[PDB]
Amino acid sequence: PALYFCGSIREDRTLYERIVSRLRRFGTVLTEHGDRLIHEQDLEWLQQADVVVAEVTQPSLGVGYELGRAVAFNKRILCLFRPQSGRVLSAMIRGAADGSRFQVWDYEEGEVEALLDRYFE
Amino acid sequence: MRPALYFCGSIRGGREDRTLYERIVSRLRRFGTVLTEHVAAAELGDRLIHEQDLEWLQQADVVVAEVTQPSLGVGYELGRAVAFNKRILCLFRPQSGRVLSAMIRGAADGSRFQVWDYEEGEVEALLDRYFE
Ligand SMILES: CNc1ccccc1C(=O)N1CCC(Nc2nc(-c3cc4ccc(C#N)cc4[nH]3)nn2C)CC1
Ligand SMILES: CNc1ccccc1C(=O)N1CCC(Nc2nc(-c3cc4ccc(C#N)cc4[nH]3)nn2C)CC1
Ligand SMILES: [Cl-]
Ligand SMILES: [Cl-]
């Protein structure tokens, strides 16, 4: 199973690395490793993905774009938000959840590995 | 029949951005109905917002996005708009110091998806150019 991961450029590099390390236990992570080429490559990975996992704690035009394109490709999507950051998640992302193919889970830093295990189990 | 225009922008930049977005929307209103003109952005359950947003995106002839401020919502609207085969104009202010996301800049084809850099004072004249 091919897994897609994305997060904003903006602090918690270790937490993104931890997420990708955990996802690597469930399949290949396409995204583990001028602007037109970047866009085309991203869209190819989104289409190959069996599941899209986004870290949506920090605002990002790119992460939002990938999620909108992923919904339209009918991808299974999991968004991870950290309410301890103090921010309030965009209603466009929170409101896209249906509980099945599009899910938005709040989490605390310590439980992210166990939440991902429960998601794939 | 009046063209239907969709406008979006982040709710995080500052009060001067709010007055600038009002000026963009005021100029857009000269060219068509602005579906999102009454969105009380500064004050921004969540499912109803998402569904009303998708209805407006699907009903638009052109989507105009102010992409200077990073925003998950603006990005999501743009990804849904591309998949809805919408004609799109992104407006970016390079004086902000930021470098626009390659996902947005790289989506441009110079025709149905364009990204235009601008200075706040020329926004009305730039919209006249696009909408003429
Ligand atoms: C100002 N913004 C931008 C400026 C220039 C270029 C892109 C953007 C942009 O909008 N972005 C950045 C790229 C994001 N997508 C993305 N991120 C990742 C990614 C992060 C990451 C971290 C750790 C590890 C490990 N181990 C692996 C990782 N894989 N894969 N992909 C596809 C979307 C948002
Ligand atoms: C933390 N983020 C969020 C938290 C809660 C709710 C949404 C967001 C979010 O992600 N956002 C905000 C809403 C954005 N979309 C949007 N903006 C507008 C809009 C702005 C505006 C300004 C002036 C005037 C006038 N006159 C009219 C305007 N119309 N319409 N729409 C559909 C996408 C990004
Ligand atoms: Cl980003
Ligand atoms: Cl926003």
Curated annotation (Swiss-Prot), chain A:
Q: How does activity depend on pH?
A: Optimum pH is 6-7 at 37 degrees Celsius.
Keywords linked to the UniProt accession: Acetylation, Cytoplasm, Glycosidase, Hydrolase, Nucleotide metabolism, Nucleus, Phosphoprotein
Gene from which the chain derives:
DNPH1
Q: Which GO terms describe its molecular function?
A: 5-hydroxymethyl-dUMP N-hydrolase activity; identical protein binding; protein homodimerization activity
- Name by which UniProt lists this protein: 5-hydroxymethyl-dUMP N-hydrolase
* A single GO cellular-component term on record: nucleus
The protein's organism comes out as Homo sapiens (Human)
Per UniProt, subcellular location reads as:
Cytoplasm; Nucleus
Q: In which tissues is it expressed?
A: Expressed at low levels in brain, colon, lung, peripheral blood leukocytes, placenta, small intestine, and thymus. Expressed at high levels in heart, kidney, liver, skeletal muscle and spleen. Overexpressed in a significant proportion of breast cancers.
Modification type Phosphoserine: residues: S8, S60, S85, S90, S100
User: What drives induction of this protein's expression?
Assistant: Expression is induced by ETV1.
Please give the family membership noted in the entry: Belongs to the 2'-deoxynucleoside 5'-phosphate N-hydrolase 1 family.
> What catalytic activity is recorded?
5-hydroxymethyl-dUMP + H2O = 5-hydroxymethyluracil + 2-deoxy-D-ribose 5-phosphate
Instruction: Name the enzyme's class.
Output: hydrolase
A single GO BP annotation from the record? Answer: allantoin metabolic process
Its activity is regulated as follows: Inhibited by AMP and GMP.
The record's note on quaternary structure and interaction partners says: Monomer and homodimer.
Physiological role: Part of a nucleotide salvage pathway that eliminates epigenetically modified 5-hydroxymethyl-dCMP (hmdCMP) in a two-step process entailing deamination to cytotoxic 5-hydroxymethyl-dUMP (hmdUMP), followed by its hydrolysis into 5-hydroxymethyluracil (hmU) and 2-deoxy-D-ribose 5-phosphate (deoxyribosephosphate). Catalyzes the second step in that pathway, the hydrolysis of the N-glycosidic bond in hmdUMP, degrading this cytotoxic nucleotide to avoid its genomic integration.
Coarsely, its chief localization is cytoplasm
Q: Which residues bind 5-hydroxymethyl-dUMP?
A: G7, I9, R10, S60, G62, E66, S90
Q: What EC number(s) does the entry state?
A: 3.2.2.-
